[PDB]
Structures are given as structure tokens and as C-alpha cells.
Amino acid sequence: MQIFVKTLTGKTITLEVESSDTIDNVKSKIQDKEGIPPDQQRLIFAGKQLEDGRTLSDYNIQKESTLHLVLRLRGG
Amino acid sequence: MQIFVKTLTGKTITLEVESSDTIDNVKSKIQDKEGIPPDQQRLIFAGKQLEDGRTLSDYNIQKESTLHLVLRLRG
Amino acid sequence: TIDEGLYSRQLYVLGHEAMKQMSQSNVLIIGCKGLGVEIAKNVCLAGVKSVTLYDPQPTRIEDLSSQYFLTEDDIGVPRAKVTVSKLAELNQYVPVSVVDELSTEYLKNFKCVVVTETSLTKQLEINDFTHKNHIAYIAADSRGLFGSIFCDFGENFICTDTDGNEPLTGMIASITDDGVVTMLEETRHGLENGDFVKFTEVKGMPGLNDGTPRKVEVKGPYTFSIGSVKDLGSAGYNGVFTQVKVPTKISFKSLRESLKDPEYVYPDFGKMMRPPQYHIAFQALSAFADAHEGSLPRPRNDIDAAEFFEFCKKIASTLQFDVELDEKLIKEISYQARGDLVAMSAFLGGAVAQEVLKATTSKFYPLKQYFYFDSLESLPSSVTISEETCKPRGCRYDGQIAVFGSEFQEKIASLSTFLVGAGAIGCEMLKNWAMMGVATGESGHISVTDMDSIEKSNLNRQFLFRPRDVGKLKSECASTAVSIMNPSLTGKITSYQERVGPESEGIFGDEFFEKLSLVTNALDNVEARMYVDRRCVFFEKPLLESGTLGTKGNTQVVVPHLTESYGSSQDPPEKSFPICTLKNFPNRIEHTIAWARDLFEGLFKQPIDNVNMYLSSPNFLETSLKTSSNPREVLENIRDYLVTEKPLSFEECIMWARLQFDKFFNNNIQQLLFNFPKDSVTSTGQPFWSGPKRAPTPLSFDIHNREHFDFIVAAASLYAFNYGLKSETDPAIYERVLAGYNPPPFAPKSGIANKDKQELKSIADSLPPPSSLVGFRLTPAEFEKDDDSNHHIDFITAASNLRAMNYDITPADRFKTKFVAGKIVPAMCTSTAVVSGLVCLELVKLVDGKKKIEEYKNGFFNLAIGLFTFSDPIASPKMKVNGKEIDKIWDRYNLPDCTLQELIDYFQKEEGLEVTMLSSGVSLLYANFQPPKKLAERLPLKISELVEQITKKKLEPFRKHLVLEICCDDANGEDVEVPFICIKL
Amino acid sequence: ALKRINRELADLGKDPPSSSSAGPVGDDLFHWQATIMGPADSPYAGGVFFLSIHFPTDYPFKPPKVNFTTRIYHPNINSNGSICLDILRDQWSPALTISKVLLSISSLLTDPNPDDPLVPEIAHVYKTDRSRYELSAREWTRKYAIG
Ligand SMILES: *P(=O)(O)OC[C@H]1O[C@@H](n2cnc3c(N)ncnc32)[C@H](O)[C@@H]1O
DSSP: OEEEEEETTSOEEEEEOOTTOBHHHHHHHHHHHHOOOGGGOEEEETTEEOOTTOBGGGGTOOTTOEEEEEOOOOOO | OEEEEEOTTSOEEEEEOOTTOBHHHHHHHHHHHHOOOGGGOEEEETTEEOOTTOBTGGGTOOTTOEEEEEOOOOO | OOOTTTSHHHHTTSOHHHHHHHTTOEEEEEOOSHHHHHHHHHHHHHTOSEEEEEOOOBOOGGGGGTOTTOOGGGTTSBHHHHHHHHHTTTOTTSOEEEOSOOOTGGGGGOSEEEEESOOHHHHHHHHHHHHHTTOEEEEEEEETTEEEEEEEOOTTEEESBSSOOOOOEEEEEEEOTTOEEEEOTTOOOOOOTTOEEEEESOBSOGGGGSOOOEEOEEOSSSEEEOOOOTTTOSOBBSOEEEEEOOOEEEOOOOHHHHHHSOOEEOSOTTOOSSHHHHHHHHHHHHHHHHTTTTOOOOTTOHHHHHHHHHHHHHHHHHTTOOOOOOHHHHHHHHHTTTOOOHHHHHHHHHHHHHHHHHHHHTBSOOOOSEEEEEOGGGSOSSSOOSHHHHSOOSSTTHHHHHHHOHHHHHHHHTOEEEEEOOSHHHHHHHHHHHHHTTTOSTTOEEEEEOOOBOOSTTTTTOTTOOGGGTTSBHHHHHHHHHHHHSGGGTTSEEEEOOOOSGGGTTTSSHHHHHSOSEEEEOOSOHHHHHHHHHHHHHHTOOEEEEEEETTEEEEEEEOTTTBOOGGGSOOOOOOOOOHHHHHTOOOSHHHHHHHHHHHHIIIIIHHHHHHHHHHHOTTHHHHHHHHSSOHHHHHHHHHIIIIITOOOSHHHHHHHHHHHHHIIIIIHHHHHHHHSOTTOBOTTSOBSSSTTSOOOOOOOOOTTSHHHHHHHHHHHHHHHHHHTOOOOOOHHHHHHHHTTOOOOOOOOOOOOOOHHHHHHHHHHHHSOOGGGSSSOOOOOOOOOSSTTOSSHHHHHHHHHHHHHHHTTOOOOOHHHHHHHHTTOOOOOHHHHHHHHHHHHHHHHHHHHTOOOTTSOOEEEEETTTTEEEEEOOOBOOEEEETTEEEESSSOOEEEOSOBHHHHHHHHHHTSOOEEEEEEETTEEEEETTSOHHHHHHHTTSBHHHHHHHHHTSOOOTTOOEEEEEEEEEOTTSOEEOOOOEEEEO | OHHHHHHHHHHHHHSOOSSBOOEEETTEEEEEEEEEEOOTTSTTTTOEEEEEEEOOTTTTSSOOEEEEOSOOOBTTBOTTOBBOOGGGTTSOOTTOOHHHHHHHHHHHHHSOOTTSOSSHHHHHHHHHOHHHHHHHHHHHHHHHSOO
């Protein structure tokens, strides 16, 4: 299984994960490839915001799935 | 022979080693006794840092010598 | 020649070439209803060359549902004629015209053509012409809670910037013989496969410094590969790589071709089967309108819905669409055909205006090609929606009633909201509320708060403020403008001038917060967001957060007892560089700017503040001797800025400026190079000034040089402002006075029981007694943007550029220095409009009081790449306390004002917990490890009395509650997490 | 932040640091006065160094402000007491206790880093004349860090 993560700036990241991996492993991989601490990552799949402690199979994330890595902004 | 290693918390650990023992073996013993990964150990004796692949004798470490185990940090 | 005083924020986003191209493009707008007027407003604020409007239909009352430039006295007049007059005032550089009749050839004068509220036949007729003549064509439609956008920029559109990001750059550590480029220690290049880079300052491989871009093959987060450099050399060291952005060719298809096989853009991946439905639905809508003399289906009418569904089936069969039509959704589109909402209008107007700017400037990635959007979850479910309750009542809210109904209109009209901040997002939100009719009922009210005043650079992205309004308060101007827009709000809006913070809890107290219905933030800093969030959590009020940054934006909703608060999640913090890097070894312009800011603070505001505070505090020295780490520095500062170096004239001020120049740009460098010569080696034998460390060079003063003279003038003017002298800007005096200065000799020094203390005491007593000077004060220099034109930005720029020339760093001009030092947030009108639209779409959900967590949508979007995402809010976590389910955020203990002993026994008896730590505010009221005597003293006191005693400050009369944080552990010794306590005074 | 601060304080209480002792000032939680003993095999032997810790309002999301109070002759500490540590500026994460910071500071006292110094004069002295640096450190610690 291989997944893609798209940032809010258009960058694409390719991750190699299994269906039984926890969300913490995915966040750790994203940190390795980007340097963002796991507590600052907001992952979205099919309108659901991924939360720590659950597995990918809970969200029915299969191969070639696309996640969105987003963040909040402070302007006004 | 016997040696003593003092940590940053003031704890002293006594070890029975030999002058021909490698630094890797010492790090393995330290990991076994305390669980501290070898990468984060910084051993200092007489102002000199012990390096893996070498022996205690290379640093003129002798009977009941005292070493200091500190953390790694640069900046 | 762009007006940097008005387009200051937009220049950080687009640039100078982009705006030069933008000011040469003409835009035509067909249709002047709510969507059309929003597009025209956003375009005018953007700064296109001109805008032409065409809409000869006479005004009808229902059009006021979303058109905010029309009034009840304009019924029967063509919309363009009555809208142009108001549109002309938004920006004085953008002429707005009107055309009473259109012809095909006449379309050749415009760079972009926007079409709204037009049948399909006219769109096909126009597009068949505009496509072959290479004119960008954008078509937008807004039907109730549904919206559609179509873009066609020609057969060979050329996009110069795709993602809109700044080019990436970095420092190399080694380039092998096979193109294996390695970054420095713990540094990420951030490139991607297929990018192009160019190298500079590479040692050992000079050929790479020519500047020819090369393909990049990323092999890891720290290293990548560029190809074979065998011929160019053997190995290279150090240097800097920089990304190159290349043009792309995008090919579009005409509307007639596109209808058969559209190419969709999905705003939400949670519903990927809908856009094919809307594609059929909108064509069916157009056909039905063509079948009823342009009469749309009546609201919530079932016969018209059946006929519309038959049209949908016929169209789907005609186009061989192998899609099974979802009857419920299509009939929903049919019911809301006549709906006209201001939130959808704002959202689509922002998006389409961004598309227009893309077409004119050829930047960012356009939509390709269809964008179908819906917010159907916003449809109320707690009220009666039927043909009887949705029929028009002949009022200006007919457009909204046609979607929601009269009962929901009454629900909206009795809201009592609270808007924090009245900037750009605030103005858009206020306009939306005025159009929707918020708080126009007998029990409605609106409260706006903002402490700033209108400036000249805010007029561009804030359309409620006119150049005649410069200097007034934001809240008053916004309230008056919205009352003008909707006369029914006269007297329903209250405006304050209070900063929302710990010092304003006397005004926004329990009485103020008990009557509210929801709080909406329009702030620009995180501290205020967190504080308002804490207040909302304590009082249990719904909250609406929204933020923008250039072309990116986000919106979040906080609902009591359902979702987590704003502060339950973290955000990336501001980057802070190591002090060693900033002080001695910089290698970037930001380092020098930060150093210059620190120097300004410590040279013009720190010493003056210290001097002023010394003259007032009688015991300052007594506490300073034992408290401050380096009292000697404070004493020397006081002496130097009080007695030793008190100026009287301007020539001595210029001499002081020259002295500081020598101190900070010629002597420190000499000392540093004396300590670490240029040929010194590290402990490993490697060169010292290699890589992140750049070898400095002393700067010799030169009056003729522009940079040095600018620094001298800025420093002298700032010093005069400090000492209240008559500054001058004539170069003749500077030239006359600077030539007679002979610098004192300077030679680096090598360094080499209570005597020091006695010396410091002698220096201290040498100072004049406090009674010598009474009432004497000096003005420290504060930071602003040309409001206090003491050359603040100019001084920082000069200092940073001089230090950059010290370390051979590339200098930055005044614009970039203003951007960095001022921490300016890039702003765009389109992003503001879009976020306001999303927030107002969430507001109707909040009003209806929906309880399921799947019905809310936090939104994120980036308009540079046409990315939209929506996600359900995070549910508040639960926990187990005393074998019961407790919400970790929205639950609290309500207790009377009881004694500490009584509270401890209450927790021991009811919850079975042993109290260990108890604190309120910033004080530790009780802890288990305190000595027995202190506790025995503090046990029989009530909580209010205990807090008064510890804080040494009486509780204010308006205080009606206290918030206590308590940490207690179970009987077994395991720590237990419990919610806070709310003591009721 | 109060709960986090109290948790760190209790964790220190449960396991004594032996070579360190940090605690609040008066009855204020946002101001601590820590104490450190110099390493035995170091010129700072037999010295007691005071440190001031100011917790920001956003702790642990913002690093604590740690400043030496006594006078110490060290390459990585200037006259104002500022400390050159990566975990206080940009490597700070909401998982480091004050105990980790004190251990890091003790390690810093164990071996200075003259390759990336904060006080160039002392760094040059350390690189050139080791004995003079040793004598200066002993004199400074016996004149400022005893009592
Ligand atoms: P954009 O930054 O242009 O507009 C920001 C507006 O928010 C207001 N604001 C900032 N911080 C506060 C606090 N603490 N209280 C009330 N209002 C605030 C500014 O005044 C701008 O109007």
C-alpha cells in the first residue's frame, strides 16, 4: 500500500504504509519527510480529520488514497 | 578491574571491565544496566572523549578510574 | 509607480510585475445582481485598469436580498445605472463605465469577460466568439445553496507561477562526482521531483555557477541528485542553490466542447459523485427557464420539480451520461432555484474575482474547468419549510426566505451576536449580517469592538472606510456604513473601543456575556484568539474563528459540549534563531534585521525607559543591586544617557551617530577577527569561517556612499527625536559637520576581594540625587509605519544593510525590510471575502442549533492552486472521574464560597479524591508539600479571602466568579485529571 | 499551564535531582529559583550557581527563559547570564521537563563548546592558553560561586 499527502502549498509526499499502521506511525513518517512535529499535523481524508490512537483501516484508507495536510492561519 | 562512571544526576555506577575492552562493549553494558542508548552517551575522562572502536588503555584508563557520562549537545 | 501606501499588503502577495500587468487589463461584467456586484467590488479593490458593467434589467425588490448597493428608493431603475455611482468610490484609480447595449465585436476591447445571470444560449453565443479571439471567459451562477464556476482562458494559456510559493534556496555541504548534492547538517532542501535549480558560490566546480537550470531527482529529505557533473569537475564544497520557476502551457476547451465531456474540480473529496449531478442539474435549469419565458421554478413547488426532473432525465439521456441521477438532490436544486443568499454570493464572488486576477496576470493555477459547490448541510431542519412558509412576502428578504422560510427569518432576526475585531474580515462579516437581517427584531442586538483607527493602507481591502473617514474609529465607521446599507439596523448596533483582554473584563463581564448568542473573531494575533476562546469556554457560547494569509484561509467552529475548543490544538510557532547566530555569525538577511531590531530596542527605548524609571522609583537601585544580573550595565546606561552624554545641539547628535556607527560596524568586527582570525582552524582542523559562518570585513565610513549617509541621517533624526531637538534633512549640514571628526584610536584588547562591589557603589553614589531632577522625562522611540515618521523602517533598513555588507550578505530594500521587521501579514480582498462567506454559512447552522457533529464543517482553502477541503470538527474528549463520564473541556464544578478546609473535605467526601495542588490565576493557593504552620494558618479562610491575602490586591466589585485549577490524586496514589472549579462569589 | 508546572514540580519532588534543587519563589508559580552544583572534575568544583527560570504564559508551547544569576567564566555564557542551548530557542518541544534542562546545563558545565562560542574572548583564551583559562575559572568560581 502507498498513499499520497498533499499540503496546503501544493507539495506532494509519497508514503509507504500498511493498513494496520496506527495514525502515530503515519505522523512520524510525515515528520521524517517534512520536520513537522506530530502534534502540529492536521490530516484530512474524505472529510474526516484523522485523530491519534486509531488505525488506517478504521477510515477505510486504501492504496493510492489522498490525504490533505492542512493548518490554521493567523491573519485578519 | 573496576571503574566508576558518574552521571549528570550524581549517580555512580561501578563496573568490572578490562583495559582491552572496547568502547562498544562499555556502551553495550551501559545500555543493559541503565537503558541509555549508545548514541546519546558522551563519556569524558580527564577532559578527553572516549570513542567507539577504541580501548580504555588508549586513554590511559587505570584501576578504579572515574569517567563522566553526559548528554550530547552542540550549538 | 504602484501606490505602496495603498497596495502595501497586496504587493507582498502578487508583486510588482503582476500589478503592472494587472493595471493594463479590461474586465467586462454581464449581470449586476449580488454575485455580479461582489465580483465588481473585488475586482475594483484588486486594481484592474477598468471595469464595464452591463445590466439593463429594471430593479426589483427581491434583488435587494444580496445586492447591498441598492436601496428601496431605486425600484424601477436599471441596476447598472444605480450601482455604478456607488462602485466608483471604492477605488479612484479604476474607472467604472456602463454600456446600454452589447454587440459581439464590441467584446474585443476587454481582456476578461465575466458572465452571470444569463441563459445558456447567450453564454454559448458569447463563448463561441471569445474562444477563437483569445479572451478569458468566466461564467458564474449562484442558485440557492449551490454554485457553479466555469473558466476558459483560451487554447494556449501560459502560466508563469504555478503554486505561488517563494523559490526555495539552501546551502550545500558537498557535491560528489555523480551529482549527489548534500544539504548541511539537519537542513531540508524541500524540493520535489522535476524541479529546476541553479547554483552559486560553489567552490571546486566553477561551472555550476554559470546559472543553467538542471533537473532535480530527490533521493532524500537532505540530499538529492542533479545528474552527471563528471566533466565540470571532481568534487565541490559549500555554495547555495536556488529554485527556478518555469512557465507552463495550459490548454482549455471551449464551452460547446466542454459540455459533452467536462473536466471537474472537486472542492470536497467527501462527496465525489455529486458534481456530475450538478452538471446535469444546471443545464436542466437553463432549459426549463427557456421553456417558461425565463421564469424559474417557484420555491418548494412539486409540479415544477417534476417538470425539472423530466428535463434532467432528457438532458442526461441526450448527452449519454452513464450516471444514475440522485432524485433527492436534483429536486433539492429545483426547490431552491429562486434562492439568493449573500453568503454564497460572497463565496463565489471571491473565487471568481481570484479567477479574474489569474486571467489578467497569468499567475497561479486556474480552475480547469468546472467548479461545482454546495453547502446543502446548512438547510434548517428545526423549522417548517414548505411552499406556504417559503412564498415571497414582498420584502427585501425574499431571496433568503425563498430558501429558509419565514420562521427561520424570525429566528435570525432575534440574534444577539458579538463580533471581536472590525478589520477586513470584520467588515465583510458585518456586511453579510446586515444583508441577512441579523438582529433586526425587537430583541436583537450587535456589539462590535475594536481599538484601532483607520489608516491609509486599510482602505484598499476594507470597503466600508472611505478616504474621508481617515482617523476615526473603525467600529463607529463600520456601524454607520452598515446602518446606511440596511436602514432597519439604526439603533441595533453598539460599538465599543475596548481591547479584548485581561484589562477589559469589567465591560465584557457576566452581564454582557450572559445575553449573547455567539461570538465571532476577526483578529490577527493568536494571544487574543486564545483569550477569547477561554472566555467562550467558561461562559459556554458558540464561537466562530477565521483566518487568512495571502491566498490561504481557514475557518473553524466551536460548539459547547460538542467539539473541542480553539486552544485544544497546536500551531507552528514563530521561528527564533539561536542567540549566538544572531549576535556574531549571521548568514541571512533575517538575522541582520533581527539584530537591527534588537539594537534599536536597546539603543533608543531601553536606555530612555531605564532613565525615566530611575528618576521615579526611590528604591530602584536597592533592588537592582541584588536583582538584576548585571547592575553595572544599568548604572552605566543611566550615567551615559543622563549626565555624560546629554546633548543640546544637533551637531553633537551627528557626532554621536558617527560614534555609534564606528562602535557597531567597525570595532566589533575588528575585535571578532582578533579573537578568531580568518585563517584559524576548528578543533578538528577544518577552516573556521566556512559554511554557516561568513568571514566579516570592517566597514570604513564614506559620506558620499548612499547607505552610510542614510544611516547617519536616520540615526541623527532618531536621537534628536529622543532629545526633542529640531532635526534637519539638509545634506549640507551633515557634510559640514561630519568632516571635522577624528575618530579616537581603537586597538583590540586581549583580556588578561570585594573591590568590584566598592567600585560599583562608588559609581552609583556618583550619580545625582533623585531630588536633583524632578518631573524630567525623555521620550523613547516607539515603532510604527510612517505614523511617527522618525525613520524607524529606514533606520532598521540602514542598520541591516550595513551589517549585511559587513558579512557580505545580500542586502534587502526598504519594502522587504518593512515586511520582515514589521511582521506584516499579507492580505488579499478575495481571501477575506471567501472566509467571510464560509463563516456566514456556518452561522445559519449555529442559529438552527444542530447537535450532530457530522453537520459542521471546518473549512480550509488555498486559492493559488484551487484547493478546498472541509473536515468535521474534533469531538471533545471524554474521561472517567469517580466512575462517571466527564467532558474534559466543557464541564466544571459549581461550588459556593466555602472555606479551604470545607472544599478539601467536600472533594474527599463526594468525589473520593485527595487534593494535592490548588491554584487560581497565577498564585499557588494550596499545595500538599507546604509546611504545616502555613497551612494551619491558611485553612480556616474562605477562598475569596485567601486569594485576596495571597495576591495582596482586593477583588474588584464587578468580579462575580473565580476559576480554580485543581490537581488531585486518587486514593491509590494515581494522579487524576479533573475539570476546573467555578467558585461563585 | 499551571497543571503542567505543578506536574513538573511534583515529579522533581518525588525523585530528588541530588545535584539540583528547583522551586518557586514566594507563592508565585511563574518564577523559579534553581540551584546547580559544579561538576567535581571541573574548574567549577565546590561552587553553587543560582538560575532564574521564567515560564511564559504559553508554557509548554513556548520555551522557559533560563538565565544564570551568578558570575561564571564560561565560553557559552555571557555576562547577562544568557545560555547557549538549542532546546531553549527552536528545538523546544512540549515534552521536555525542567529536569532535562538542568541536566543539559550540567552537561554544558562539564564540557564547553568553543567551536560555536557566545563570548569570543573566552573562547580564544580556551583555545590558546588552557592553563590561564583554568586559573581564571577557579578564581571566578571561588570569588563568585561560593557562599
Ligand atoms: P487585520 O489585522 O487587518 O485586522 C485585525 C483587527 O483586529 C483587531 N484586534 C487585534 N487584536 C485585538 C484585541 N486584542 N482586541 C480587539 N481587537 C483586536 C485590530 O484592531 C484590527 O481591527
